[PDB]
Write a protein that binds this ligand. Sequence first.
Ligand SMILES: O=c1ccn([C@@H]2O[C@H](COP(=O)(O)OP(=O)(O)O[C@H]3O[C@H](CO)[C@H](O)[C@H](O)[C@H]3O)[C@@H](O)[C@H]2O)c(=O)[nH]1
Ligand SMILES: OC[C@H]1O[C@@H](O[C@H]2[C@H](O)[C@@H](O)[C@H](O)O[C@@H]2CO)[C@H](O)[C@@H](O)[C@H]1O
Ligand SMILES: [Co+2]
Length: 284
Amino acid sequence: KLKLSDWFNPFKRPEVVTMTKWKAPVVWEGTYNRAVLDNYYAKQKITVGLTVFAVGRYIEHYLEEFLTSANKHFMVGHPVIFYIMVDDVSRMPLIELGPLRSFKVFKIKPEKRWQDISMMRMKTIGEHIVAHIQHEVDFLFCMDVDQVFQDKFGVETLGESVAQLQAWWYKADPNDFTYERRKESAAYIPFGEGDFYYHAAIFGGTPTQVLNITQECFKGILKDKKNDIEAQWHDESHLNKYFLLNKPTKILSPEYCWDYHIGLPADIKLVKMSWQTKEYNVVR
Ligand SMILES: O=c1ccn([C@@H]2O[C@H](COP(=O)(O)OP(=O)(O)O[C@H]3O[C@H](CO)[C@H](O)[C@H](O)[C@H]3O)[C@@H](O)[C@H]2O)c(=O)[nH]1
Ligand SMILES: OC[C@H]1O[C@@H](O[C@H]2[C@H](O)[C@@H](O)[C@H](O)O[C@@H]2CO)[C@H](O)[C@@H](O)[C@H]1O
Ligand SMILES: [Co+2]
């Protein structure tokens, strides 16, 4: 079957981290052979899912740009199902989809606090995995809507459990990571521990692993709320605690989720996806 050597060459990007101590690749531009994987996964006849939430002011502008860019760049060459969660379906925009792309739309009850809106994604994703997604796709990605694909986001990102390196912290010291540091929170990580700071804007895997990711994160969210404490960065704090305990089998470089407000160092060879401008006081 498939072995890492067949498609991944860490030595092509010697100036960055390309392998972990638990044998997972960190996928950087130039390290991967997409054609080998496109052919590998086509033989298997895979379908890839993508969930996205859009609640309130986020619903219209961001969603159109997300979906337009997604149809253009996400897993082209393979069937894809876009799962869209909205609070008012009538505001869902019309986006023409390319061959082998389709979508499903679901109405969700919007939460009061912007933080619960984000954290409740974990419960909702799990419910839909059990109800249908586990039967509809072989791999699943869950993404924030306030970002845009810029180049091919393809099958090189697929794996059992996939994590995203946060662009602002990928070369930082772990003691500087913004983990949750209070021992009272289920997301607690002490200083001196941690491998990477993962971004909650992108994670994925098989429906099985995504279910465990979202279920475990949601249990921690719940246990925290029952002790009147909310983690520093909400679901992202719990996600980082999860991936510390359950190592991801694949990690995506910051090229796959870049913030141009950082600049463009030589590390970032080809951006596949970029942040939208965070406007907490305007869109939120
Ligand atoms: O009013 C809202 C609030 C949230 N969302 C959805 O929830 C996601 C998360 O909200 P942000 O994109 O504003 O969050 P940030 O990227 O700024 O901050 C980070 O921390 C958050 C928790 O504080 C989440 O974990 C988030 O995924 C992570 O990127 C959005 O992308 C969107 O999909 C909405 O649609 N509308
Ligand atoms: O720290 C988690 C948090 O990071 C935000 O990104 C900040 C970053 O924390 C800060 O060091 C840098 O100077 O500015 C970035 C842009 O605001 C993310 O926006 C947020 O989603 C979390 O991931
Ligand atoms: Co976001």
